[PDB]
Amino acid sequence: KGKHVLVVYDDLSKQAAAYRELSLLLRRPPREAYPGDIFYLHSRLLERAAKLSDAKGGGSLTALPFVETQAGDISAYIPTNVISITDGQIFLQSDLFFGVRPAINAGLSVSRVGGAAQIKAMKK
């Protein structure tokens, strides 16, 4: 319609944890019990967030998906999936908020779009 939206997906992990159930109840042939399509699950979703061309009213929906990592193992099935998808990610260690607070691991955290986002004030 031409307005800007912001969608926070809080804990996509539980969705997948759910959908697995859903799929396993329907006895869908099961890596890590998650359905082969468990990727497509989040793909066709986060994809629906973008910036519509000015031919379409310059509208946008920003997505802030969440993922609950056990032990901080970023190599886990779900996490690689959600990552291979989003444009960048911000990884929060607790390894830290027990020094630098809002635990933001400056090392791994990326932004693909980044810099094209910040205004000329930030950029320089």
Added chain:
Amino acid sequence: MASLRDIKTRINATKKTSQITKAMEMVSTSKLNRAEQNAKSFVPYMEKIQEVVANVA
């Protein structure tokens, strides 16, 4: 509990640590048997000082 590829990172880290360690042990063992060389080389000068410093009555 824990990882696997996070258990490899630790092994290899430890290994490269032992390497660097044992390096220097041998290296510092090579600097003991040169301490004599400059220990010996000083043996005479000391002898021929207390021999001089025999001390007048």
